[PDB]
Design a protein around this ligand. Structure first.
Ligand SMILES: NCCNC(=O)CC1CCCCC1
Ligand SMILES: NCCNC(=O)CC1CCCCC1
Lengths: 237, 300
């Protein structure tokens, strides 16, 4: 059934599973028309499909051409996502296919279920966690590959860089969700925190800076402070 | 006009004949029902005064044989049986009618309620949903489960309604996932009507039979089937115009006949609100929407 704080360690067991987030699949810029009406212009989007145990990210880039001539785009985005996730599963060798797919939004359940009818043994699950994966486009290297795409494209990343050499996947996921929650609550401040010190660099093959274990504790503390501050600045506390 | 005689009434029971109901006292001199409308299927049904558990009854068509009721004290129920000796049967019934031991089926209501509820219902199709091939009549009760219920346990006592499942490979063409899920016309017209039922009359027959089993026996699987068959039509953008007009008439009589105090358990709020106000056919069921809004505005 639904995934929540009670069964939270299930994410890091040895059953292959994927999170699917579809918030940035259909994105637009808004512009007033010459007549003074409002018009949207679609921009490139992405499906965020993540193995939380290994860090493997299947980033399917959604090029704006897929919306050309189509109606009801938010509803089509749900079925396009499900079509691309099903296509990804079919492309994986049998022993790499997931046993469970957890969707971040309840509106993806029926489209994914219908697209995965051929896979009756793969469970499609909601979650009650409010995961911050929408902020994936605040990661510079991910945003860059999405906006530069001229055609549909899949790009594979490890969203944990090399952290799993030194920490467990439970700890790596907790670090990732802390970073993404901060980028979602105040992107400018979170990015200042991550890059303030110019001696700490991002390897060419990485997404995040090359922090020592000690610097990660400082960083994580600065992110917690940011989130708590904003939550004060927000509710006045 | 035909007759279903009773050997006796040894236990106190409410007997219903179609939409009608009457009470028989324990060992009351009762020998059956006469003046039954030839040309319709009929249902004779029972609720014991002692144990309201298990409503049960029999679907029959008097053109197919001479049927009577006899209480069985071992199995504890009123059983339908066929009499093969036609001269014996006639003689028993004439002697019974002469003594006024039988109650009389009403003349015909102005609304033609039974005809309208059973327009498409045929005994031969009932007997394929209810498989007991040695009898010409079909037993149904409140507890019998459907084939679809049994896939999610005694096969001989099941209701073999046509399985309808909107998230199934039968319902969804590979490559038309979004199309077929949001517009069920393929599944209605090609799979079910052309493929399985052959025509809309057989579809409506099963829909009407499911409703009547839900209403008369409180059979939950039958209620599920009735609503599924409604929802499949309303959720199709492309439906023959004659079918929509006939569906509106079918449902109007069903809603008109449903006891007001059974609406909570026999009507599915989600299906009816979707069908009347959100579906492709939201504007095609004028008579049904009007009686629903006057009789059950609460559900909506
Ligand atoms: N996901 C459907 C489209 N919604 C957005 O892409 C969000 C933008 C952000 C502010 C400008 C207008 C809406
Ligand atoms: N439906 C309640 C009674 N309705 C009648 O008109 C009288 C009953 C009909 C069945 C035969 C016994 C008398």
């Amino acid at each position: 059934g639904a995934m929540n704080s009670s069964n939270y360690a299930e994410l890091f067991n040895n059953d292959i599973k994927l999170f699917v987030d579809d918030t940035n699949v259909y994105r637009v810029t808004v512009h007033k028309t010459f007549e003074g009406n409002v018009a949207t212009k679609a921009i490139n989007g992405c499906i965020f499909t993540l193995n939380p145990k290994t860090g493997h990210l299947f980033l399917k880039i959604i090029h704006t051409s897929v919306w050309a001539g189509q109606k009801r785009l938010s509803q089509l985005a749900k079925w396009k996502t499900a079509e691309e996730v099903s296509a990804l599963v079919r492309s994986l060798p049998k022993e790499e296919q997931p046993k469970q797919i957890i969707v971040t939004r309840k509106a993806m359940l029926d489209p994914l279920e219908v697209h995965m009818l051929d896979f009756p043994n793969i469970a499609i699950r909601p979650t009650e966690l409010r995961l911050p994966f929408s902020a994936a486009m605040s990661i510079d290297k991910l945003s860059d590959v999405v906006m530069k795409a001229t055609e549909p494209q899949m790009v594979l990343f490890n969203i944990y860089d090399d952290w799993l050499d030194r920490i467990s996947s439970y700890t790596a996921f907790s670090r990732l969700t802390l970073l993404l929650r901060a980028l979602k609550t105040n992107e400018e401040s979170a990015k200042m925190i991550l890059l303030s010190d110019p001696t700490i660099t991002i390897k060419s093959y990485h997404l995040w800076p090359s922090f020592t274990d000690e610097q990660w504790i400082t960083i994580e503390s600065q992110m917690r402070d940011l989130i708590l501050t904003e939550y004060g600045r927000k509710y006045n506390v | 006009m035909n007759t279903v005689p009773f050997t006796s009434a040894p236990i106190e029971v409410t007997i219903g004949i179609d939409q009608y109901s009457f009470n028989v006292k324990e060992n009351q001199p009762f020998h059956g029902i006469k003046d039954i409308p030839i040309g319709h299927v009929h249902v004779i049904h029972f609720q014991h005064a002692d144990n309201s558990s298990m409503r049960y009854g029999y679907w029959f068509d008097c053109r197919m044989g001479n049927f009577y009721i006899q209480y069985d004290p071992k199995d504890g129920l009123y059983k339908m049986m066929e009499e093969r000796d036609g001269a014996k049967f006639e003689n028993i019934v004439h002697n019974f009618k002469e003594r006024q031991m039988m109650v009389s089926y009403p003349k015909i209501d102005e609304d033609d309620t039974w005809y309208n509820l059973t327009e498409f219902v045929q005994m031969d199709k009932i007997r394929k949903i209810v498989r007991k091939d040695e009898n010409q009549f079909s037993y149904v009760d409140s507890s019998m489960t459907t084939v679809q219920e049994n896939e999610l346990s005694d096969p001989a006592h099941s209701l073999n309604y046509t399985v309808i499942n909107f998230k199934s490979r039968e319902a969804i063409r590979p490559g038309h996932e979004m199309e077929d899920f949001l517009d069920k016309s393929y599944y209605l017209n090609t799979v079910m009507l052309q493929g399985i039922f052959k025509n809309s009359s057989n579809y409506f027959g099963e829909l009407q039979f499911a409703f009547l089993n839900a209403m008369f026996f409180g059979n939950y699987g039958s209620s599920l089937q009735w609503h599924a068959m409604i929802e499949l039509i309303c959720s199709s953008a492309t439906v023959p115009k004659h079918m929509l007009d006939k569906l509106d008439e079918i449902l109007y009589y069903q809603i008109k006949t449903l006891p007001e105090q059974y609406s909570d358990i026999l009507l599915n709020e989600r299906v009816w609100n979707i069908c009347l106000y959100s579906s492709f056919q939201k504007n095609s069921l004028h008579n049904t929407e009007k009686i629903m809004e006057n009789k059950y505005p609460e559900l909506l």
